[PDB]
């Protein structure tokens, strides 16, 4: 890991929050060396992200330097497109609508630069309809630079220069998974395909595309720019770079947080700036990620850093980078039960494992929060969570076992005392 | 609730404005022709923008625009959440309840809205326009239990905002589309400054 | 004509035998010596199906509503 840091400085990959959020002249960071970057060929950028080996901030590994170079057929006769996500579907993420808040010029910096690696034709970015004021300024941020003759259709100095076509969903599902977005980009109902047909860079819209995240392509200008010998900065030799965080739950200041790989959460969450709940001698029961990570008590996770294998050394790792706690006042069972209630109101409905398996649980998880009659249903409720893994298509089958499967772990007198109270009350 | 039509208005009618037909030209120009074939996500939502809630006669209209079968449109409008088929109000309010918003003291930004307003919970107002729903997953749980409106959002909620936003909109004011208190820029507060400078020598791209 | 029971003569009327093959099918109608008529076994097209061909660029097989 090195020196247990993961500091915070001003030499970052973000421009700045409070400096200027509107249109501008791209002062120092943006459009610094514009045409000289894409003057070279694709192999100058293909494998260039291996200096970081950026894993990808969508919610999994499979490094974004590898998916652009490898698993990328050259050409047969048909065009190619780019699909950049912007939907934030994990609850309490806030990693988006902060990049679009103050730094919108950076996203078109590497849109044309990232598409040169694939050689795609057009760029389709996808914003949630609910974020309407920020997405209104995004199309204004097009006309500030793109209309000014800097980009498209041959600008600048290259035969490769293209557009960015903004769409919106309404209330959709396609955040948490690809292959439902390239279906909902068409007009169909967004009930997703199988994920390996012929996976997403074989069968797409009409012709093969790519799926990336916001800071999977927002860091791509400066990672191709600063590069190094800096791209391995913090953490071990597994993960490398600096990733965006957020602090939510119980804090004096729940605020946006920026750091690098493998910081211990005991000194990271208490910093920036107040840890207003019980820092110790209360519970401070923590969740590693957004929704694909179950509970941890006050045990070794506070000594464990934020490496990918550090949480995989524990029961569950996470890539959403969202921190939520509940020390004293909150009921433990009550909070996560409304996160299983969440999945009933987003899930697709195709596969009989996910549909009519979540509702098997949501009917009975609301019984455990009440406190009711005889236990040993817990192991049955544990088995059903053990029975949705490879059965569903998308990750929301796998993202619905995990808050159950870890609540059943780690916590013996959760409802053994609660159901005792109602068994005593009925007595 | 149900999702069926017991023949309220088969022919409402609902035709578009000639200002709106030329905006349909721009959308079809984006998509590649042939597999264009469905621009139904902005086209049907543009019909929501003119009306406010779209009846069944609006669904039959866009099929004749895009030469699709009609059942291809009845389907899609009943999946996504934002579209409205029942009648709605002038101000459609959303109280974003989730797990961290439950932890962020939604409890007072819960009821005591109805003690402030006087309606049933989760229900439209009996008169005209206040219609109350609750939604999930929009951005910041790093803020308070924020309240979105049809054009913006209200960060940093509190019962004083319940005493304000409900109150000021009954007279028709604009109750602060943003964080009403706290940090105006959503900063680390103890890490906010970080020595604002040019970003430490741009030009490592020699390589 | 007292109830409606479909009464009958024709004392065979309920006999199915199960033979293993055609080669030993006709070898029983001759040994007891009655006439016959032989059908044929029908097995379907092999055939060509491929999920993932339901999404096209210029072809005609492209499904929706799923």
């Amino acid at each position: 890991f090195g020196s247990l840091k993961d500091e915070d400085r001003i030499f970052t990959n973000l421009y700045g929050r409070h400096d200027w959020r509107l249109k501008g002249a791209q002062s120092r960071g943006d459009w610094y060396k514009t045409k000289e970057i894409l003057l070279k060929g694709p192999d100058w950028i293909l494998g260039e992200v291996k200096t970081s080996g950026l894993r990808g901030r969508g919610g999994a590994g499979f490094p974004t330097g590898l998916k652009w170079s490898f698993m990328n057929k050259p050409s047969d006769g048909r065009p190619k497109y780019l699909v950049v996500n912007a939907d934030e579907g994990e609850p309490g993420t806030c990693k988006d609508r902060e990049i679009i808040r103050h730094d919108p010029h950076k996203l078109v910096e590497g849109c044309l630069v990232g598409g040169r690696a694939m050689g795609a034709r057009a760029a389709y970015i996808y914003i949630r309809g609910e974020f309407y004021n920020e997405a209104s300024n995004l199309q204004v941020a097009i006309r500030e630079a793109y209309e000014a003759g800097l980009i498209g259709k041959n600008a600048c100095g290259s035969g490769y220069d293209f557009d960015v076509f903004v769409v919106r969903g309404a209330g959709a599902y396609i955040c948490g998974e690809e292959t439902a977005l390239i279906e909902s980009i068409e007009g169909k109902q967004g009930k997703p395909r199988l994920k390996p047909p012929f996976p997403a860079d074989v069968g797409v819209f009409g012709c093969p595309t790519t799926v990336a995240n916001v800071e999977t392509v927002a860091v791509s200008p400066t990672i191709c720019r600063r590069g190094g010998a800096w791209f391995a900065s913090f953490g071990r030799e597994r993960n490398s770079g600096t990733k965006l965080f957020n602090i939510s739950g119980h804090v004096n200041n729940p605020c946006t947080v920026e750091e690098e790989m493998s910081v211990p959460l005991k000194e990271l969450i208490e910093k920036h700036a107040g840890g207003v709940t019980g820092g110790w001698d209360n519970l401070l029961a923590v969740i590693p990620g957004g929704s694909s990570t179950p509970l941890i008590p006050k045990s070794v996770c506070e000594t464990v850093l934020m490496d990918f294998d550090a949480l995989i050394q524990a029961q569950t790792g996470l890539g959403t980078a969202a921190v939520i706690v509940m020390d004293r006042s909150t009921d433990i069972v009550k909070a996560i039960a409304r996160l299983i209630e969440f999945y009933k109101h987003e899930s697709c409905g195709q596969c009989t494992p996910c549909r009519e398996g979540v509702d098997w649980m949501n009917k009975v998880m609301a019984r455990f929060v009440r406190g009711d009659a005889r236990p040993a249903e817990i192991d049955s409720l544990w088995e059903i969570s053990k029975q949705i893994e490879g059965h569903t298509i998308c990750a929301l089958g796998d993202g619905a076992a995990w808050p159950v499967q870890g609540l059943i772990r780690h916590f013996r007198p959760e409802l053994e005392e609660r159901m005792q109270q109602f068994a005593q009350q009925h007595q | 609730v149900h999702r069926d039509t017991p023949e309220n208005n088969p022919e409402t009618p609902f035709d578009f404005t000639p200002e709106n037909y030329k905006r349909i030209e721009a959308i079809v120009k984006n998509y590649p022709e042939g597999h264009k074939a469905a621009a139904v996500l902005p086209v049907l939502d543009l019909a929501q923008r003119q009306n406010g809630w779209l009846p069944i006669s609006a669904m039959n209209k866009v099929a004749e625009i895009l030469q699709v079968p009609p059942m291809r449109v009845y389907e899609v409008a009943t999946f996504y959440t934002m579209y409205n088929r029942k009648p709605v109000g002038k101000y459609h309010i959303q109280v974003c309840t989730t797990t961290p918003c439950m932890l962020r003291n939604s409890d007072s930004i819960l009821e005591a809205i109805q003690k402030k307003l006087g309606i049933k919970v989760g229900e439209t107002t009996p008169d005209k326009l206040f219609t109350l729903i609750e939604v999930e997953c929009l951005g910041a749980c790093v803020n308070a239990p924020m309240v979105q409106i049809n054009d913006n959002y209200y960060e940093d909620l509190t019962p004083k905002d319940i005493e304000e936003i409900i109150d000021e909109l009954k007279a028709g004011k604009i109750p602060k589309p943003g964080p009403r208190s706290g940090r105006f820029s959503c900063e680390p507060a103890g890490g906010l400054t970080s020595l604002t400078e040019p970003p430490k020598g741009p030009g490592f791209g020699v390589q | 004509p007292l109830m409606g029971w479909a009464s009958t003569a024709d004392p065979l009327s309920n006999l199915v035998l199960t033979f293993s093959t055609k080669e030993d099918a006709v070898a029983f109608a001759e040994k007891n010596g009655w006439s016959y008529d032989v059908e044929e076994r029908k097995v379907p097209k092999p055939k060509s199906k491929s999920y993932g061909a339901n999404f096209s660029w210029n072809k005609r097989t492209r499904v929706s509503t799923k």
Binding site: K153 | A26, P32, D151 | -
Partner: peptide
């Protein structure tokens, strides 16, 4: 911060330059 006024976004300057489109065919 305005519920309407999408023609400023949609067809104001993005109608002059699309660009181009060529977009292929796909008749089908």
């Amino acid at each position: 911060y305005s519920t309407y006024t999408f023609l400023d976004l949609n067809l104001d300057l993005s109608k002059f330059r699309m660009p181009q489109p060529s977009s292929g065919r796909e008749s089908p």
